[PDB]
């Protein structure tokens, strides 16, 4: 026996079933059912899809550490992680099953990281909107200033 | 059929006078199908996106040079056109009898987008000149600050 490159056979019980033995059913029927309980070896998906996707999706957290200036390229990092995740979606669509009884783990994870990347893009847009406010266009809100500069460090 | 509409559907008895009467190739009956493609799928999913993405490259001429995002827009349009070409490449055979119409438009758009990138490079080169790098002659000033703007009805 040479084990399949992707599937390990964990169990294989067999059962002889008899049914339709009732008077209304008429003549009895029988069969033999073997149940191959097989385990996937996920190494290919781990190395080629999941690990690169996890790292690329972790990169959006770095946007919080780039400056909120013209040359910071905060949104560059965030939206290009989204583009890379779209490439990974195209890659994953070639492999996943095409049923609708449940959502696969790979698809759930990819949609989750895409949603997180979208939220972080919105966050970066908001931070850039707040940071580049100038006296010649925007007025000084004292409430937000007291909340963020004075109250937050003492609360934190 | 979901993609093909039958226009004509004739039937003919073809007899080859040149072949001998004892040849299988003498006689046949041919049923022809002239079929027109229904292009709604290709229109919606390829042509309108591809054509609009190609046309957006002309927006770079209205972008100011100080935005710092001109050649990026143009080269990204070129990249999207390349993605569309990758899309087309899987759908048709690699025959040499003619270039497909969508292929013709994609080649034309790629060439024009490349010219637009070159133009953007030249425009940015002109925009960032200074006295320590270039000399602004009087003829160039007369041509580009008075004469061409009045012909072009510029503000």
């Amino acid at each position: 026996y040479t084990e399949n490159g992707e599937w390990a056979i964990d169990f294989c019980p067999g059962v002889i079933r008899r049914h339709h033995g009732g008077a209304t059913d008429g003549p009895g029927e029988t069969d033999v059912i073997y149940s191959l309980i097989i385990r996937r070896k996920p190494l290919f998906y781990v190395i080629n899809i999941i690990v690169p996707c996890v790292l690329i999706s972790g990169l959006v957290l770095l946007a919080y550490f780039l400056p909120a200036q013209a040359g910071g390229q905060k949104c560059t990092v965030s939206i290009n992680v989204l583009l890379a995740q779209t490439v990974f979606l195209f890659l994953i669509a070639q492999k996943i099953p095409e049923t609708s009884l449940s959502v696969p783990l790979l698809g759930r994870f990819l949609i989750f990281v895409m949603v997180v990347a979208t939220l972080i893009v919105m966050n970066c847009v908001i931070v850039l909107n707040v940071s580049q406010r100038t006296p010649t266009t925007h007025a000084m809100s004292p409430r937000l200033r007291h909340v963020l500069l004075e109250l937050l460090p003492r609360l934190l | 059929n979901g993609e093909w509409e039958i226009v004509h559907r004739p039937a003919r008895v073809n007899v080859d006078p040149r072949a001998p009467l004892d040849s299988p190739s003498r006689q046949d009956i041919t049923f022809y199908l002239i079929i027109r493609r229904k292009p709604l799928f290709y229109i919606i999913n390829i042509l309108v996106p591809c054509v609009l993405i190609s046309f957006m490259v002309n927006l770079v001429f209205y972008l100011p040079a100080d935005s710092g995002e001109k050649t990026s827009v143009a080269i990204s349009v070129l990249l999207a056109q390349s993605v569309f070409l990758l899309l087309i490449s899987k759908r048709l055979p690699a025959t040499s009898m003619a270039i497909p119409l969508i292929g013709k438009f994609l080649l034309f758009g790629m060439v024009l987008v490349t010219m637009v990138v070159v133009i953007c490079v030249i425009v940015l080169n002109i925009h960032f000149r200074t006295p320590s790098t270039h000399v602004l002659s009087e003829g160039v000033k007369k041509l580009f600050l008075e004469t061409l703007p009045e012909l072009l009805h510029m503000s």
Binding site: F11, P13, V60, Y64, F112, L119, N123, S131, T134, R145 | -
Partner: protein, 49 residues
């Protein structure tokens, strides 16, 4: 400069929020698989070691 400092504080707190969100969600999704082992069935292994 006041505007920049406000942006910095927002960035600081939202980094921790995003880190917790990403880490917790990924961990939950993958621990869903961690508890999806083949059940301990009352049968011998298919291949005897």
């Amino acid at each position: 400069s006041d505007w920049v400092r406000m942006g910095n504080a927002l960035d600081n707190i939202c980094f921790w929020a995003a880190l917790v969100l990403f880490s917790v969600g990924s961990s939950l999704i993958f621990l869903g698989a961690y508890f999806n082992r083949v059940p301990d069935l009352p049968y011998a292994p298919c291949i005897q070691p």
